[PDB]
Amino acid sequence: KTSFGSLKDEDRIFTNLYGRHDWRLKGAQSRGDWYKTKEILLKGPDWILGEVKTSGLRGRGGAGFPTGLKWSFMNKPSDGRPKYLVVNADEGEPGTCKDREIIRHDPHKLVEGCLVGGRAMGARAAYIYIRGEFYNEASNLQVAIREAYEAGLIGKNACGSGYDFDVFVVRGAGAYICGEETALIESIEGKQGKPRLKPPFPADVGVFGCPTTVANVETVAVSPTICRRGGAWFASFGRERNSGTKLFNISGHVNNPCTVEEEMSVPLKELIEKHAGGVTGGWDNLLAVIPGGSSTPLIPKSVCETVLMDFDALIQAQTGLGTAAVIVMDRSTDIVKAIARLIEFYKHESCGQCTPCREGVDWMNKVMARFVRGDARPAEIDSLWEISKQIEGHTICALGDGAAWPVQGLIRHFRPELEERMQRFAQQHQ
Amino acid sequence: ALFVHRDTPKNNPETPFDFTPENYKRIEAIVKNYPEGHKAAAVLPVLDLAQRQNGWLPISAMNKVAEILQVPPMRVYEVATFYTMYNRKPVGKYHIQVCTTTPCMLRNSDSILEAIQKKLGIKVGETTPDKLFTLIEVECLGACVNAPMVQINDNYYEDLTPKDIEEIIDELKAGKIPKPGPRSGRFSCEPAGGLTSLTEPPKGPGFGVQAGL
Amino acid sequence: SNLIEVFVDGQSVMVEPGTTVLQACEKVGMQIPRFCYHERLSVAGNCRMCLVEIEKAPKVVAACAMPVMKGWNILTNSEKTKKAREGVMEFLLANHPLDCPICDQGGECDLQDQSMMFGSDRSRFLEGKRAVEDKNIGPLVKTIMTRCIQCTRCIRFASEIAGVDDLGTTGRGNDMQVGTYIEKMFMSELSGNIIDICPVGALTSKPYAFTARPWETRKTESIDVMDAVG
Amino acid sequence: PFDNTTYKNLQHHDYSTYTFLDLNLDLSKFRMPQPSSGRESPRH
Ligand SMILES: NC(=O)C1=CN([C@@H]2O[C@H](COP(=O)(O)OP(=O)(O)OC[C@H]3O[C@@H](n4cnc5c(N)ncnc54)[C@H](O)[C@@H]3O)[C@@H](O)[C@H]2O)C=CC1
Ligand SMILES: Cc1cc2nc3c(=O)[nH]c(=O)nc-3n(C[C@H](O)[C@H](O)[C@H](O)COP(=O)(O)O)c2cc1C
Ligand code: SF4
Ligand code: SF4
Ligand code: SF4
Ligand code: FES
Ligand code: FES
Ligand SMILES: [K+]
């Protein structure tokens, strides 16, 4: 198969995404949730790991690491310490709101995914680190957790299989840096949300020093569907190493901003034209598209015509897939102002532990503010580029790369715009 | 935005603070949610619980939380200063937060901002004279397809225009509680031009289950 | 014997398991520059000065925290190692105040010495620096937090050696301040030793302040008689 | 009757400020005994 997109409603995993049906236990049980879970629990961790590594499912958090291998390093015999699965439900990234709808509208899918994942690695309990601002979603998840506890699906003798598993909900306190897995692990333990250094990986030393696997909501909620329908069913979509379905949040300067599931290798132009209703002012009014939120660099209209929205066709397009969050800017937008706002967001969300981010993100914010005001010279611009090259790869966590990438993308794609802005400032005020 | 504390008669270590007995039971449940030997994790929820006692954190809840969990108070100070959702100053009853990140900036969140500023007669980070509102500016809050959006207390008011946020402010001043939802025609996340996807009824259990399971 | 083979600049050497890159380079004889690392404190790794390059690998690793494995060749004098050092120290000196003539650390400052050794020769910073509000922690240690580089030797010393647990970091980002958050005196048995382990002139000795300079003082090795420890 | 036009997530209009903590307190009677590290505190 070579033509992707136009996903049929039968193959969509996330039914009741829009909340038109019941989100509680009885509504979810009539859609396919909690069905033959005890058979999977009896088949066990080797079968679950094989079925999730046959599908080719990667990490939907934004790094794209293979889920089978990542859940496979944790499978090892015990050394006296318990094992834990932790679900990253933070989404501090701008443009991304898919897991909010997953938690609010399909919480039992998340709980069943937690149970299947904890069976895969032999985890003792599950910790769900929801965002601090998401009070209603946390309460909905707690209601669904109590409803599953009442029916005997989890807790004592989970689903009639003899396995012990628990689920906990830990609210955040409004931090983007807590979305990072090691910083999330530290913030669970009651400390400041500052990321650790790998090694040690969380599979060896994680939360409370126990073995730990941190997985996204989107890659956890699809695990029972993978283990039930089959790995080849999930692998039948998309390209090779690009298998499955993906949730896209299209927003910005579009007619109908929305969250919609789609085939993993759908073209960007087809997705924008079909689901979002088109760019404001037509397709010819396009200026720039950010494919995966503020971490991923922007791409102009010249590349957006013939691009595919998977991992490989976007890393080859000098950008990244990220969280698959589409931000659309048309011709009536100041790109430098948008990038300056993104850098201001990155400097307002920075843990300040390690030196290069702590100094260089503020430096980039000041330089970008001077760029927006135009009070700068062209010779500074490449210097700003070098500043990004002194941040990427020299930081503890990947917020430094996620802050250096938009500046590099904006410079590389719109150096003439910046040069025109500063020369207009020079010829006007001087 | 000062990260150091100066002793004032309003905010002193001798400020009266103590949890209610029902909050003591809730704190005990929070502590029992965590493994033994790692009680310090309970610093994160319980301190937030203290905020729900007052709406803000004087330096008497931090010392009390440090005392009931056997942790030094400087760790509680670190926790209260690292995160932005803990109020170390007395905020108003209705704390309004406006998201001005780029997916919300493209859909004119600054229009909402100047409408609120014109209506309430205050600026960003300023409290109303009757202590009913407090307007600040925050980063992204994870509802970017519903841009522009604001958050009041723990409720989300999304997809607003200036008229809707004016109506929300007049409803808050009257004492009623508005519905925490988008003010447009759509409900949660569907496109405004009709449901493009998920129009089929759900298949139900037993569909697509492979053999040998 | 569990000693494994590693290479520093092509030179083979034996190491124990669990050895960091910094200790292996010291065993060969190379002193990797460091700011937050201390041989008697826990490994923090929040300054990124010790970023050394392992060959056949597309990333620099923190030598103060990375455990070595077999077959590793460590390049302590390559090009990208020096580029990483220069970028990290340019970031470090971006917000540092111009306080060198009025500093007691001048002439024995670690930042000055490795700025001359591994740093660049000019500053491209054309913005405004920050200014941290000062603190009081007693009549022994003079505090000027404008010069602190947030190395967190304060916290590790007060938490692992002195056992006070009264020093910490309040803030998030460029405005994070190392202090006590209240008017609290850091009074302890070993409360002066932070002046020994501050790489900058942020914590100085108040009785010694503005009196002498390190290059004109003669050092005589002697024995303390104040107690029976010797 | 299959209704595809009414938003079914209507419970969250009734949530108070103590809903999450009360739900946790009510759920706390169904939980496993937590494992112990053999000490009260890391500073013990
Ligand atoms: N989803 C969101 O809200 C956001 C997503 N992102 C995206 O996330 C990515 C950055 O996140 P990272 O976790 O730093 O990415 P990646 O470097 O770390 O690693 C992904 C996962 O693989 C694991 N892993 C990698 N090598 C391993 C090994 N040898 N052994 C065991 N485990 C190993 C890591 O522990 C981690 O859990 C970027 O792609 C960025 O665009 C960025 C910001 C927000
Ligand atoms: C600054 C930063 C913030 C992150 N925030 C999130 C997040 O909010 N949600 C998420 O799933 N992953 C986030 N990640 C990615 C995680 O490091 C990691 O990929 C995730 O916890 C699990 O990814 P997986 O799906 O491959 O298992 C963030 C990474 C960084 C560097
Ligand atoms: S890159 Fe920034 S946010 Fe990440 S560990 Fe370093 S200082 Fe913290
Ligand atoms: S600490 Fe060092 S670099 Fe800083 S002012 Fe003093 S002598 Fe100069
Ligand atoms: S005052 Fe000195 S020792 Fe303390 S954290 Fe700052 S640089 Fe390190
Ligand atoms: S950009 Fe405003 S909610 Fe995300
Ligand atoms: S000495 Fe290794 S990062 Fe500071
Ligand atoms: K010193």
Short mmCIF file of C-alpha atoms in Angstrom, two decimals, chain A residues 8 64 70 75 98 114-115 128 143 157 174 203 227 236 253 273 329 372 410 417:
data_model
loop_
_atom_site.label_atom_id
_atom_site.label_comp_id
_atom_site.label_asym_id
_atom_site.label_seq_id
_atom_site.Cartn_x
_atom_site.Cartn_y
_atom_site.Cartn_z
CA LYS A 8 -12.60 4.29 8.24
CA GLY A 64 9.16 7.88 18.81
CA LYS A 70 11.04 0.27 26.00
CA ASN A 75 11.12 -7.21 32.09
CA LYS A 98 -5.39 14.87 22.66
CA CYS A 114 -2.56 0.60 32.65
CA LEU A 115 -3.59 -2.91 33.69
CA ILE A 128 -1.12 8.58 36.84
CA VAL A 143 -14.70 8.35 39.31
CA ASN A 157 -7.84 -10.18 42.31
CA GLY A 174 1.38 23.68 36.99
CA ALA A 203 14.12 0.87 34.10
CA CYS A 227 -3.26 -7.06 22.24
CA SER A 236 -1.40 -2.64 8.47
CA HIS A 253 -5.24 30.05 11.81
CA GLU A 273 -8.10 20.54 3.78
CA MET A 329 0.01 30.54 10.63
CA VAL A 372 10.78 41.82 17.04
CA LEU A 410 12.89 30.45 11.85
CA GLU A 417 12.28 38.65 6.73
#
